[PDB]
């Protein structure tokens, strides 16, 4: 009863047998911006079914030595779908996301992944240089990896210089191969401003880090893909202009 579940948004639907409940981040639902909180005076557009729906990205193959991956959400969807086209033609953006991570495996496999939504996730430079002018900075494509995602060098600090053990202070869910085959989290829109640009700013990141490694026996299936599905939810756009993708 609680294990089984089905979502639906737009024309897309997801069904799960073995799922464990659902995480609603910070106890609030996504909403449209209220009149009091609004600032920009133009009438925002609310596409609904054309934008809000599940989008599936390419799959990551999880291997015994895998170090984990991450994504930036008002990034991955900027070049894909109708959501991506509204984002390039509009200067202002607001929405929440419903997030779903999926990893199958047999009852003979063992391991655990930590799925976490970590707002304002800022990757850092890796090096001992204390001089600000010569200090390393983490690339463009490492900061906004796009649809393909990026992988951690040293997941223990989350590339942020911050302990992964405390990452449970963020909306998070475990996917444990013996318990559940998927993790689901709904994130309301959070930021210091009512709207914000989609192409410049990344509200929050996602982190799938293999805490307990992947282990199995000879003869079992070796290839274990990981797939993420994200639904932009309760979207808004404003500030229409010509397309700027970068």
């Amino acid at each position: 009863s609680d294990r089984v579940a089905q979502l639906t948004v737009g024309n897309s639907s997801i069904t799960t047998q073995e799922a464990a409940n659902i995480v609603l981040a910070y106890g609030e639902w996504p909403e449209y911006c209220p009149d009091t909180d609004a600032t920009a005076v133009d009438k925002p557009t609310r596409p609904d079914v054309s934008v809000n729906r599940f989008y599936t990205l390419d799959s990551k193959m999880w291997q015994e030595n895998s170090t984990g991956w991450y994504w930036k959400f008002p990034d991955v969807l900027n070049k894909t779908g109708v959501f991506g086209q509204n984002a390039q033609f509009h200067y202002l953006y607001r929405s929440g996301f419903c997030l779903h991570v999926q990893c199958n495996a047999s009852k003979f496999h063992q391991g655990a992944l930590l799925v976490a939504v970590i707002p304002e996730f800022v990757i850092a430079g890796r090096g001992s240089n204390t001089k600000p002018n010569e200090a390393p900075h983490p690339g463009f494509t490492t900061t906004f990896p796009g649809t393909t995602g990026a992988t951690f060098h040293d997941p223990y600090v989350l590339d942020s210089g911050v302990p992964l053990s405390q990452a449970l202070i963020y909306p998070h869910q475990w996917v444990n191969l013996r318990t559940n085959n998927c993790a689901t989290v709904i994130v309301p829109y959070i930021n210091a401003v009512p709207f914000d640009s989609a192409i410049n700013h990344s509200n929050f990141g996602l982190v799938v880090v293999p805490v307990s490694p992947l282990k199995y026996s000879s003869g079992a299936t070796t290839a274990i893909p990981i797939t993420i599905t994200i639904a932009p939810l309760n979207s808004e756009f404003g500030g229409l202009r010509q397309a700027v993708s970068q």
Binding site: H153, P163, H172, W174, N176, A192
Partner: protein
């Protein structure tokens, strides 16, 4: 009515709790299918198992106060956000300038970085002295220079007339100078982590130094001189302390595990990763 489809909470609530929680007496239970101990950590919810359910407890009415742990008493303590060195005698010089950043160094930075968003007022205190620690009856001027105001170009500059820019004239032997500051951000909260770029355009993969910077945190400049027409010969050092009051905090996050290499950037050195813990002898022996 002509078309139907155009025709179209939260979870919890906050309880005011003045004191720590009490404990109620419980006894042994033997029965089936009631199990407060078994939890599922996969759901992302922390264990709701309490004392009373796990073992037998007595009746304890707890008088311990919870007040001292509020975020508004946690930041009520003042700390050193910057120190500026002024030498009026060396060469020309004559003034000192300090761009306002409370990330300047550690203890207060590490506290404020356990929240992503903070809205608050501030109170600055200026402790000034000689390099030798002694005090001498010289008058100083502290001028605040909001973003976009022209900076002083010299000790005699007209910038110091201060018809607009607020100033503080105080002699050096007097008690420290103290002022209140409002919440000046153009946004609705300060944010200590901004993932994104301040501008549009191309972003090289060689030098990204534009990355990470949030313009909403730039409060401008704080300048200081000593008021005379002739250049005094002395060295001088000004420590700046700030209380942080009327504070609100959002979306907490973990503390810094690693030593801070840079002021504006969360860089660390990946060879030296500290493994926050202390090393031990195997397991299954505790000290």
């Amino acid at each position: 009515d002509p078309v139907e489809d155009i025709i179209h909470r939260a979870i919890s609530g906050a309880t005011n709790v003045e004191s720590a929680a009490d404990t109620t007496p419980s006894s042994h239970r033997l029965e089936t299918g009631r199990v407060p101990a078994l939890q599922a950590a996969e759901t992302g919810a922390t264990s709701n198992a309490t004392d009373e359910n796990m073992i037998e407890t007595r009746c304890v009415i707890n008088r311990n106060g919870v007040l001292e742990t509020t975020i508004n008493h946690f930041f009520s303590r003042s700390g050193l956000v910057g120190v500026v060195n002024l030498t009026d005698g060396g060469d020309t010089t004559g003034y000192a300038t300090w761009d306002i950043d409370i990330m300047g160094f550690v203890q207060l930075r590490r506290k404020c970085e356990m929240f992503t968003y903070m809205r608050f007022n501030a109170e600055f205190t200026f402790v000034t002295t000689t390099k030798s620690g002694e005090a001498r009856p010289y008058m100083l001027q502290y001028m605040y220079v909001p973003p976009g105001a022209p900076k002083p170009t010299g000790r005699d500059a007209f910038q110091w007339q201060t018809a607009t820019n607020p100033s503080v004239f105080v002699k050096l032997t007097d008690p420290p100078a103290q002022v209140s500051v409002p919440f000046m951000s153009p946004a609705s909260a300060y944010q200590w982590f901004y993932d994104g770029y301040p501008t549009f355009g191309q972003h090289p993969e060689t030098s990204n130094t534009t990355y990470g910077l949030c313009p909403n945190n730039m409060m401008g400049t704080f300048a200081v001189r000593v008021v005379s027409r002739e250049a005094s010969q002395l060295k001088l050092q000004t420590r700046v302390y700030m209380k942080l009051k009327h504070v609100r905090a959002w979306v907490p996050r973990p503390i810094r595990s690693q030593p801070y290499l840079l002021k504006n950037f969360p860089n660390y050195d990946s060879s030296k990763i500290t493994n926050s813990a202390r090393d031990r002898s195997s397991i299954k022996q505790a000290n």
